[PDB]
Amino acid sequence: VNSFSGYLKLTDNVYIKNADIVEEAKKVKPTVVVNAANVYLKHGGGVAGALNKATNNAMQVESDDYIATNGPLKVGGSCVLSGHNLAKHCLHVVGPNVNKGEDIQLLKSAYENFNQHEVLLAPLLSAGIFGADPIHSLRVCVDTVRTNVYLAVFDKNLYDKLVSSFL
Ligand SMILES: N#Cc1ccc(OCCn2cnc(N)c3ncnc2-3)cc1
């Protein structure tokens, strides 16, 4: 039993809710919140900008030190950093950005990072400003992630489209 509330069960291990990931995190304080990161951990907009703003820029400060030490992530890769006031840990995962021409096949590699964590609160990778089709992202999630994932979708219209088209 866990404290995630109000989710639709899609499969044995994937759940989805019409919800704000920052509010979910503030409420649940999950062990892991996933960020929709880029390779430079520059949290300017989208989910990343929202998560970072909610940490009062502490996520960005920590991320800048990470990059200065380690260099950029790979597309499809991840790193574990602090979750600050939102979660124990933040798993920064880089999905391909279609607006940068990146290969959508890398979306599966991106979701594989979730399997290193037993339970996660997450957005749909490569959705929104990353340019991919969120219906496709949800399908790859369900077909790749085997651990327990709680997906938070910002927009009622999108949430209803995802549910009503889910096979
Ligand atoms: N009109 C409209 C509209 C406004 C924001 C919006 O956010 C999508 C990405 N996103 C950003 N910030 C958050 N805290 C999120 N939680 C889940 N997804 C999140 C989508 C549609």
Shape, per Cα inertia axes: globular
What is the CATH topology? Leucine Aminopeptidase, subunit E, domain 1
Terminal Cα span: 26 Å
Strand pairing plus helix content: what structural class?
alpha/beta
**How many discrete domains?**
1
CATH class: Alpha Beta
Name the CATH superfamily classification: Leucine Aminopeptidase, subunit E, domain 1
Largest sheet: 4 strands, mixed
Q: Helical stretch count? A: 6
Radius of gyration: 15 Å
**Number of DSSP strand runs:** 7
- Placed side by side, the strands forming the largest sheet appear as 1-2-7-6
Portion in helices:
25-40%
How do the helices and strands follow one another from N- to C-terminus? EEHEHHEEHEHEH
**How big a fraction of the residues is strand?**
15-25%
Give the distinct bound molecules. 4-[2-(6-amino-3H-purin-3-yl)ethoxy]benzonitrile
Report the CATH architecture: 3-Layer(aba) Sandwich
PDB class: viral protein
Keywords: Macrodomain, ADP-ribose, SARS-CoV-2, viral protein
Assembly: monomeric
Entry title: PanDDA analysis group deposition -- Crystal structure of SARS-CoV-2 NSP3 macrodomain in complex with ZINC000043461211
